[PDB]
């Protein structure tokens, strides 16, 4: 009976932060560079005309 | 029904303990009826072999008084 | 546990039939005696400690060897266990009387009692005589009809032990 | 189990407190730890409810 | 019954019945004749109550007897009325018991999983027991109708 | 009280009050006026009840008021009668509450530790409570006397 | 918890006084309202699932954003948690009404609700609006006499939340 | 997600991911492109899938849009189709995720309580998701239709 | 429990031999059939409620007395326990089918179920009829090969109860 | 918890939107990085003990007072707990890198760590120094691009602790 | 194995296996053929692996075979090689199982107590296991070496 | 448990006698043996791991099939369990020798050892041979006099096992 307060009311959700999208992440940047190469290869797979 | 008398052996597989464990492996206990499903499931999940279960308190097949 | 009402309900339910005239007759018989049972239970609860004191004194006067050295009731521990067992018998007999049915007795007292007492070395006959002493004290204390009612359940306990 | 499910335990630690406090108190008494995560709180709150 | 509930409450604490528990036992036994007459009244009228309640059931919710409904067909309708007969018998048992434990342990515990296994809609069953409540309370006096309606209300709340 | 026990029991099962619980509370509140006049009778004549109970206790137990007794003297006898007055007020509280609960928290929990610390013999308490039972039940009618006697019996059993 | 009778008893016990006429007047008032309270509690017990259905429907009609994507009550889990919270509020309000005292709303309900809801991001304003919605539905259900009584406890819950 | 389950399973044992789990993640990462193509195929045709599943549902269960049915009315039927669209979106989510974790967290946990508070029949939900399964697997090649049917079957089992 | 791979590992470990050609033949036989097992298990998972409902309908139609008053499956509670048992049987048979070994049925199904039913008074022959009903219903769903495979474990359950 | 896939799913679930071209591009980017992530995770898992040894060696070389008598890492318990915390940080950094998302770092590492350490007298700056030494050791083992990626999660831990 | 872990994880939650777990089992059975090929390759090279592993251990740790060493004598050296053969068999079992669970159950639980009672030096175990790993990986191709060396690494960590 | 002194006290308590000359004589006998018992217990405490090593070596040399595959001591877990059991037997025999009474063996070691071993499959005859092997090794260290006294409790353990 020292305290009637709730020590753990709930846990704050961590589902979404504010900012830091991690799309500027350098290896994400490298992947976005590589998908461009893949799209270009698919484009050159089409007939030349 | 209300009471099962259960004799069970629970061996050990995860580790060899410094404690004696003669207490916990071979035992007989009284588990009340609506605890028996959970208790039996836990005993089976620990790897034990249920040696016997008996009726002691209630009467099988009773409708009221359960 | 089953009282008289739940016992009747259970029988008619396993038959799967509505209540008949005999069922209502048993229910009237139970409701008729309910006030007598409540008075007896209140009188017993009011005098439970007194009943146990007189019954244990009578038991250990008729069998002084029980509490003398070498008797099963010789220690503070085993004497306490003896009087606690008498307390259990009295309270559960009162329960069975108020329920009007003996199912609580074999459900919560008699199941495994004889084996336990034999493994411990508790004399069954002396326990029966303790129940009889409790029966006499309680019957003198409650009154003739309540005496007969409580005696039914005391005799049930005695027959279950012996 | 018979102590923790008794009416005395209920008067001491179930009735005076909200269900979240109930979860953390019973977890302290019976498991030796506070409430562990949000999923545990949800589970025991649902059972209490 | 009331006696069993008082006894188990006392036994859990290893005590005798308190003056309140004994008082409630006296209140129960002194009311035995009235609730017993109520149970009889519900007993003789069981066929009439079941048939009117089923008629009201089908009128209010016709999908059950409509194509694609659980009660569609004759034998399924007979089973529909058989369940209502079961629950009316359990209501009489609850009335003589003075508490809803016979109802709970014969026809309430596990009822959700049962009717789920049978594809029986619990809203439809709640409409069934409300029709039974209306019919049964129709044949009773107000003082008796109150107690009978309380048990039917318990059944309706438990079913869904 | 009766209402509080019903509520906490129902809250222990995360449910609403059953028909039996509601019927019990209804019977309790319907009996409120006889309870209140019994509390009237006990309160209006508390001085006479305590005086007569003290006389009976000290005549059946002269050792308490003899030298060496726990209640020997003027002030210790006054404290004895003060304890009796406490318990009479507690019985009135329990009567209005409809259960021994107020008696139980105010005067039964830890009573054995208190009276061991004070060196008040518990059989003396039992005799005093029995005397006060007889005196107070002599003032009431049979129906009320039995009900208050159940409270005095609960108190005596707790002291025993 | 604490009810009206126990509140009077404790008030007089702290003073160490026997019951005066004012205490008996308060007890008389509670005993007089007892029948109304029992009838209201029975009605709410009979229609609780209904009450939750219309209250939730009304709240999500007044604030459709709560159950549409992005709202706090948008998912099956969060919708179910919303309904469960409303079931708490209704049941504990019924307890407090039957008791005649708001204490149980203090121990079992309002203690730490703000902290839980602000930790979870549960919108307290919308929860208050849901409590109000339950208040209209329950008051319309119970009748003129009991609606005023139950409003006391619903508004007590709302004021504790806000 | 597959990675999320692998990480959580490893965490529960307080260990690094084993080469088996890393190979599982490697295979999932390899099949990500096929998964995205399937998800786009189901997204581009969501209007047609919803319309055809609603049709098939209402021929196979006319009672739902019949009087007394939950989907009765144009507004309630629009809510029905909106729920179907929710679940199709969750199916595409579970396709790209590689597991039913988004489906379970968004649309399966507490769905029984939600639909009970909504008075929505669960056999109706199961029939509707079976309709969506038929329509959506009709739009896909055998290999992709099998893996989409797995998510639809999980949804049907979780509703049933 | 042990699956087929762990089974052959244990069998070759008990003699302390390395895997022979026959051991690798057994392992190839298991890995060849694994994909069929995965379709069978996914199909059964999709239709567990349907399978249990059809099997229970068949069992209680062939034995109407089980669910009429006096039968072992007569109450909501005992009926629900019956269908819970069938649900567990079906899911564990699916487990044993995926594993390719009847061991999990020994450790987690038959481990004390026999004498539990015996003390309960559950009729063995009726439970065998229910297992056979699940067998037919599940085979008609999973096709010929998966039907034979599932039936093997179903008859293991039946003979364990018999 | 969240990974990159779940993060895109959540941002398109709050809006109630089916996946667009942008979401498919984000999913493609993650699926492209998956091979590198799995390679780095396997390398770190094979070399965890080496990393802990080297990082704790630099930490205790720079802060010798931590292992001199009276220091926070002075006893076998406290040294073992220190290197256990370093193992925890390495494991959860590897989890986070494999998920492509730092939510696990907040949920399962940073939550209450600061006041855990403050209630134990664990120096937080020296823990951050240990984390930086661990980052330097890991970067040499996983290669330049994996080093840059792993530095993000190590720096997330360091910033959350600071 | 992987199947047993998936089954016990599903049974812990009292559910059927999710489409993700089924896909994991599908990948496992796909990799089974390569796993048996690797285990066959190590099973064929029994005596080679044992011979070079023992020679490297004895040259790297002459004290074990020297006077006073634990393996001094023909019979003790034979027991040393016998233990190596045991552990190589366990590694083959682990290769077929897909995890270190058989190694864990037969030769890792209580190994330190066993070698304490036998007065076998644990670092000698670690070095013998490393030599076995080197020989086994050498006799394999580039692909098989990684997965085989993982099990030897686990075993050495268990001994260390 | 009871030692020699407590045994004499109990045999005098049962008959309710104060100590006579004979009781003091038996006490003097125990305090005469006390120094020998303490010296032997300390010697065994210093040499427990050794005595276990030779005892297990003798058991496995005489019965090699116990540790090859198929034997009950074949695994690291089962070998560790075997030597653990032997260490328990030695420790409890030392306790019994120091106490001078064999009640500790029946109360702790032998109560339920038959059921446990037979259900597990532990061969009793081999365990008895291990008891004898341990006794023979211990006798060489304790000394000629203390050897027979310790052998008393070793044969007690064996006969309880036999
Ligand atoms: C302090 C009193 C006490 C003792 C002594 C005791 C013994 C004991 N031995 C056990 C198992 C065992 N005991 C042995 C030993 C036997 N195997 C070989 O054949 C040898 C001949 C022989 C030993 C000399 C083995 C191998 C096991 C493992 C059995 C299994 O695999 O389950 C177990 C089961 C749980 C466990 O493995 O830890 C107990 C409880 N229990 C107690 O409460
Ligand atoms: C070895 C453990 C043990 C003890 C201690 C023990 C005491 C004991 N004392 C008893 C009676 C008694 N005991 C006393 C002693 C009290 N008289 C005064 O009040 C004193 C304050 C106090 C003693 C200094 C008396 C007077 C009686 C007789 C009461 C009666 O029979 O009515 C009895 C019941 C019947 C009998 O034996 O005569 C027991 C069992 N029994 C045991 O097995
Ligand atoms: C609720 C129903 C219930 C009953 C009835 C019951 C009986 C019971 N009595 C016991 C002991 C005992 N019971 C007695 C009483 C007997 N011996 C005396 O001589 C008398 C003749 C006789 C009583 C009239 C004694 C002396 C013991 C001590 C046994 C011992 O320690 O050796 C024990 C052993 C556990 C313990 O001592 O804590 C049980 C289980 N247990 C229950 O749960
Ligand atoms: C409402 C609950 C409550 C109770 C019951 C209560 C009793 C109580 N009685 C007391 C003293 C006392 N009580 C008694 C009464 C005893 N003497 C005889 O033996 C009789 C058997 C018996 C009374 C019938 C006596 C004689 C004293 C004086 C003790 C002393 O001063 O040493 C005291 C110490 C303070 C004082 O001396 O006034 C308390 C607190 N207090 C509470 O808060
Ligand atoms: C993403 C997870 C999620 C789901 C799935 C969800 C469903 C959902 N459906 C609702 C209404 C509804 N839903 C349905 C659909 C049903 N009617 C028929 O019987 C069919 C069997 C069945 C659809 C196949 C209907 C008819 C309503 C209207 C009910 C009413 O207005 O009373 C509501 C109430 C509020 C609203 O209309 O927006 C919710 C929250 N909510 C969620 O957050
Ligand atoms: C009896 C005292 C008591 C109460 C009432 C109580 C409520 C409570 N509400 C919770 C979550 C919640 N509560 C709600 C309900 C709110 N969100 C909607 O928008 C509505 C506006 C509003 C209800 C009308 C929701 C949606 C959650 C889920 C939050 C989350 O998990 O993200 C939780 C966390 C556990 C869980 O999600 O199951 C608790 C403990 N706890 C208590 O101990
Ligand atoms: C005493 C407790 C108890 C109850 C209540 C009980 C009911 C019960 N009803 C059943 C069938 C049934 N019950 C119904 C009734 C439904 N039809 C409509 O949907 C309505 C909503 C509703 C009736 C108001 C129907 C249609 C069936 C047949 C279902 C089928 O064959 O698939 C069955 C399956 C076997 C049989 O045909 O009898 C049981 C066990 N059994 C019990 O042991
Ligand atoms: C995981 C494996 C497992 C199983 C299967 C299992 C079955 C099981 N069934 C039980 C009761 C029951 N089981 C049944 C089922 C039977 N009645 C019908 O006639 C059928 C022929 C038959 C089922 C097809 C019934 C009716 C009961 C209730 C018995 C009673 O309360 O009297 C109980 C008693 C405890 C409880 O219900 O909570 C168990 C443990 N336990 C396990 O650990
Ligand atoms: C009070 C309890 C306690 C202990 C015991 C303890 C031991 C300890 N020994 C250390 C280093 C060391 N310890 C040793 C000792 C080993 N060299 C040989 O191999 C021998 C087998 C063995 C000693 C007999 C050596 C050589 C180092 C230096 C490691 C290095 O320079 O890389 C360190 C690293 C930090 C430092 O050197 O200041 C610690 C913490 N710390 C404690 O808080
Ligand atoms: C299948 C799992 C399993 C294992 C691993 C196992 C190990 C094991 N090794 C043993 C002996 C031995 N083992 C060794 C090996 C050591 N000598 C050097 O120190 C080296 C560092 C090292 C070898 C690499 C030696 C020398 C002995 C003879 C012990 C002695 O006679 O003192 C024994 C005693 C029984 C016997 O000799 O047959 C066991 C049980 N038993 C098992 O059931």
Numbering used by the authors:
A (entry chain 0): 891 to 939
B (entry chain m): 2 to 67
C (entry chain i), G (entry chain k), I (entry chain h), J (entry chain j), L (entry chain g): 1 to 162
D (entry chain 0): 792 to 840
E (entry chain c), F (entry chain d), H (entry chain b), K (entry chain a): 2 to 161
Q: Could you give the paper's own sentences about this structure?
A:
Phycobilisomes (PBS) are antenna megacomplexes that transfer energy to photosystems II and I in thylakoids. Here we show the cryo-EM structure at a global resolution of 2.9 Å of the 5.9-MDa PBS from Anthocerotibacter panamensis (hereafter A. panamensis), a recently discovered Gloeobacterial species that diverged from Gloeobacter spp. around 1.4 billion years ago. The A. panamensis PBS features a configuration comprising two herein characterized linkers and presents a paddle-shaped morphology. The two-fold symmetric PBS contains twelve APC hexamers assembled as a heptacylindrical core surrounded by twelve PC hexamers, with approximate dimensions of 273 Å (width), 500 Å (height), and 129 Å (thickness).
The heptacylindrical core in A. panamensis has two distinct complexes—the bottom pentacylindrical and the top bicylindrical subcomplexes—each with a different combination of Apc protein components. Instead, ApcA2, ApcB2, ApcB3, ApcC2, and ApcE form the bottom pentacylindrical core, and these five proteins are phylogenetically close to their homologs in crown Cyanobacteria. However, both ApcD and ApcF are absent in the A. panamensis PBS. Although ApcB3 only exists as a single copy like ApcF of hemidiscoidal PBS in each bottom core cylinder, ApcB2 (β3) is found at the positions occupied by ApcF in other pentacylindrical core structures and is likely the functional equivalent to ApcF that occurs in crown Cyanobacteria. Additionally, the position of ApcD is occupied by an ApcA2 (α1) subunit in the paddle-shaped PBS. The linker proteins were suggested to provide microenvironments for the bilins and are key bridges in energy transfer in PBS, namely the linker-guided pathway. Both linker-guided and non-linker-guided pathways are identified in the pentacylindrical core. The final overall resolution of APC core complexes ranged from 2.38 Å to 2.73 Å, allowing the assignment of all APC subunits precisely based on the corresponding amino acid sequences.
